[PDB]
């Protein structure tokens, strides 16, 4: 037959029948590269590390999301502070950087 | 001068440090821990195996009267019977065949193989950790028994060292435990005197020569039926017997952090958990001044193929420009960077190769000759081999663990949105200053 065992760095000892013990530890041989493109480094601390790594992908999701909304809610904030003074008046010669800087 | 440094408590394991004095050459320091004896105190509580269940001859007075009587044996049975007129070979054994009482009698004593089947249960205490040390500084290398307990010094012949306490406090044997033929167990045996029948401890002695058995095997004398003479009796199995059958796993095959369970006395050997903190009176006499070590004017470090494995995966070069010929010890300063020697001879000028094993992606550690440090920076690959027969000697760190690119990732991704949030402030706070002066 065949019996699967898991080894941790730890490591794990097995006896069969009556020969010595064996002792055996466990790499961080992962499959990817730490040095490589963006998704074999998450492939690779994926494998070695699930939680860990999905913890920091989640905390970078979150960062730069709030990021894009904050940056949003600041030029929107800028937008109504530099033109509601100029909407509310006649003949809004606006020089045309503000607007163009803000609107997309 | 005395030197703290706290090891890691792992057999077998070389841990490497450098000593390094006001104004005398560095002297290296590597501390391996040779064995380790994590024994506690016991004391005997009992002795049990397999009762002999023996059986007293009946007596018979049958047209006078019997009385059961007291006496101290083992599980003691006592029974007084009627009409019975038994017969042996003859067809009678008894005149006045009414009124027959007859005595049965009944108890239990060692059985003649215990001497060598037989277990012993014990209680232990808090647990005493006693570490074998071998420690080379400089060129002097010397063996010592020490106790980890933080009082207690080993001492050879010039050199003191004082060990623990063990940073968490741990012990494979429960408070009760069982020895069986070198194989422990811990179960939670009856306490003396409080014997229950068909389990382990029914019998109980201060030892195999003891007198004073005390058993309780819930044996029941019945009423003979059959004419012939005899005596019938029902009592519970051996409760060693039924123990045997299932006892389970010793602790030998079950002791957590992989360590050898030994008897005689009960220790547990090699075996790794914590860390030991210890300091080291070093000999004056060890250290020789700068002014005779030599110094190295320049070198510079480039790392061959390196690897982050268990073993002594990578390999760097020094390429050295001295002033005289000796014997420069070499370190890693890095926690995440352990080299293979210690002390190299040294040329005026030439190059050296070094091997190290490192558990990080990145060889971005410093490397000190003569005391003179260098940066070796270099890239590390995964490991090819994914088991492998030593165990690991650097533990993994955090910080140090990350690749560099992928720092730089993280870094990026995350001064962007700093970047994003420093932006939008400066911009409202602009607007801000600008709508004042302007309203």
Same mark, same amino acid.
């Given at each position: 037959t065949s019996r699967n065992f898991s080894v941790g760095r730890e490591g794990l000892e097995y006896v069969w029948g009556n020969h010595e013990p064996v002792r055996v530890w466990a790499q961080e041989? #992962?499959? &990817?590269?730490?040095? &490589?493109?963006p998704h074999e480094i998450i492939i690779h601390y994926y494998h070695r590390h699930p939680v860990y790594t999905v913890i920091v992908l989640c905390g970078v999701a979150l960062a730069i999301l709030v990021g894009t909304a904050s940056s949003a809610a600041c030029i929107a904030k800028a937008r109504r502070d530099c033109l509601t003074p100029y909407a509310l008046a006649?003949?809004?010669?606006?020089?045309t950087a503000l607007a163009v800087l803000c609107c997309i | 001068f005395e030197h703290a440094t706290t090891v890691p408590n792992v057999p077998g394991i070389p841990y490497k440090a450098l000593v390094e004095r006001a104004g005398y050459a560095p002297l290296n320091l590597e501390i391996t821990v040779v064995s380790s004896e994590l024994t506690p105190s016991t004391n005997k509580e009992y002795v049990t195996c397999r009762f002999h269940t023996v059986i007293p001859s009946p007596q018979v007075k049958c047209c006078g009267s019997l009385e059961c009587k007291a006496s101290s044996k083992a599980d003691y049975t006592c029974r007084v019977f009627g009409g019975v007129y038994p017969f042996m070979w003859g067809g009678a054994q008894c005149f006045?065949?009414?009124?027959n009482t007859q005595l049965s009698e009944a108890y239990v004593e060692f059985a003649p193989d215990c001497t060598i089947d037989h277990a012993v249960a014990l209680k232990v205490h808090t647990a005493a950790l006693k570490v074998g040390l071998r420690i080379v500084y400089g060129n002097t290398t010397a063996h010592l028994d020490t106790f980890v307990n933080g009082v207690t010094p080993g001492s050879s012949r010039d050199l003191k060292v004082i060990a623990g306490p063990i940073s968490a406090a741990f012990s494979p044997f429960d408070h009760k435990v069982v020895i069986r033929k070198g194989l422990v167990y811990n179960y939670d045996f009856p306490e003396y005197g409080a014997m229950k029948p068909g389990?382990? &401890?029914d019998i109980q002695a201060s030892?195999?020569? #003891?007198?004073?058995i005390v058993a309780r095997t819930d044996i029941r004398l019945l009423k003979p039926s059959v004419k012939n003479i005899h005596v019938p009796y029902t009592q519970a199995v051996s409760g060693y017997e039924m123990w045997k059958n299932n006892? &389970?796993?010793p602790l030998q095959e079950? #002791?957590?952090?992989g360590c050898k369970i030994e008897v005689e006395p009960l220790r547990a050997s090699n075996c790794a958990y914590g860390h030991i903190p210890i300091s080291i009176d070093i000999p004056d006499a060890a250290f020789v001044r700068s002014s005779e070590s030599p110094t190295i004017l320049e070198v510079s470090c480039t790392v061959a193929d390196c690897i982050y494995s268990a073993d002594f995966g990578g390999s760097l070069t020094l390429q050295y420009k001295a002033d005289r010929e000796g014997h420069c010890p070499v370190h890693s300063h890095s926690t995440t960077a352990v080299l293979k020697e210690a002390t190299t001879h040294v040329t005026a000028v030439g190059s050296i190769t070094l091997h190290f094993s490192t558990?990080?992606?990145?060889?971005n550690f410093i490397v000190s000759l003569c005391g003179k440090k260098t940066t070796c920076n270099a890239e590390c690959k995964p490991?090819?081999?994914? /088991? /492998?027969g030593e165990p690991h000697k650097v533990d993994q760190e955090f910080q140090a663990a990350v690749s560099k690119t992928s720092w730089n990732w993280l870094l990026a991704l995350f001064g962007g949105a700093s970047s994003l949030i420093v932006v939008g402030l400066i911009v409202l706070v602009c607007s801000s200053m600008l709508i004042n002066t302007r309203r």
């Open positions: 041989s #992962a499959p &990817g590269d730490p040095h &490589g493109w006649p003949n809004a010669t606006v020089p | 006045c065949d009414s009124e389990a382990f &401890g030892s195999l020569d #003891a007198t004073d006892s &389970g796993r079950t #002791a957590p952090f558990s990080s992606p990145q060889a490991p090819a081999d994914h /088991i /492998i």
